[PDB]
Amino acid sequence: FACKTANGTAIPIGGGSANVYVNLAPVVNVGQNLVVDLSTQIFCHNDYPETITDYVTLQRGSAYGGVLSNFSGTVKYSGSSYPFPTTSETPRVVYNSRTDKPWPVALYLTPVSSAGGVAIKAGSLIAVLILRQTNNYNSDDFQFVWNIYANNDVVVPT
Numbered sequence: 001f002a003c004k005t006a007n008g009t010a011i012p013i014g015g016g017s018a019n020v021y022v023n024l025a026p027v028v029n030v031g032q033n034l035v036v037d038l039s040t041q042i043f044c045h046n047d048y049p050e051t052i053t054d055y056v057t058l059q060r061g062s063a064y065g066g067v068l069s070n071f072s073g074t075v076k077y078s079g080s081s082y083p084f085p086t087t088s089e090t091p092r093v094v095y096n097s098r099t100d101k102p103w104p105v106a107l108y109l110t111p112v113s114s115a116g117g118v119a120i121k122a123g124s125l126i127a128v129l130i131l132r133q134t135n136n137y138n139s140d141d142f143q144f145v146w147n148i149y150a151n152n153d154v155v156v157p158t
């Protein structure tokens, strides 16, 4: 089991870390959502689908910088929604193919009332998403750690 990003980088068999940049709407008001859909960026696959089933969870989701201070959020993982930052590990998604499949994670961030001005700085760390992978074969239990960086400024109009 391993993962990669679109025109980007890879995390190999056995886990590791990688940095991911995301495009963000440049202006968002109180009451509107920034949607950060990572499923167009992170893709994972099973390396032996004929004898092994891989199980993949969102173990944890954490907010940093401008998101942590100026936004409340939810996360959607494979059709279900959770608070963001997260309060527990999700149910699992099955990886049963050698073909790249998206990692179905999306952040929904809404500015808090105290947000105004540049609420997220370009190039700043906004979130960490941990992918935890296990299987039905052995005791492999691996973390794939995705550091999410803002590509651009996000302004909350006053």
Ligand SMILES: OC[C@H]1O[C@H](CCCc2cccc3ccccc23)[C@@H](O)[C@@H](O)[C@@H]1O
Pocket: 001, 002, 013, 014, 045, 046, 047, 048, 049, 051, 052, 053, 054, 134, 135, 137, 140
């Ligand atoms: O995605 C399927 C699996 O692929 C890798 C390792 C499988 C390699 C392997 C090791 C020892 C005995 C094997 C016997 C048959 C097939 C693979 C074997 C690891 O990423 C596992 O965590 C993962 O569950």
Ligand code: NI
Pocket: 002, 045, 046, 047
């Ligand atoms: Ni592979």
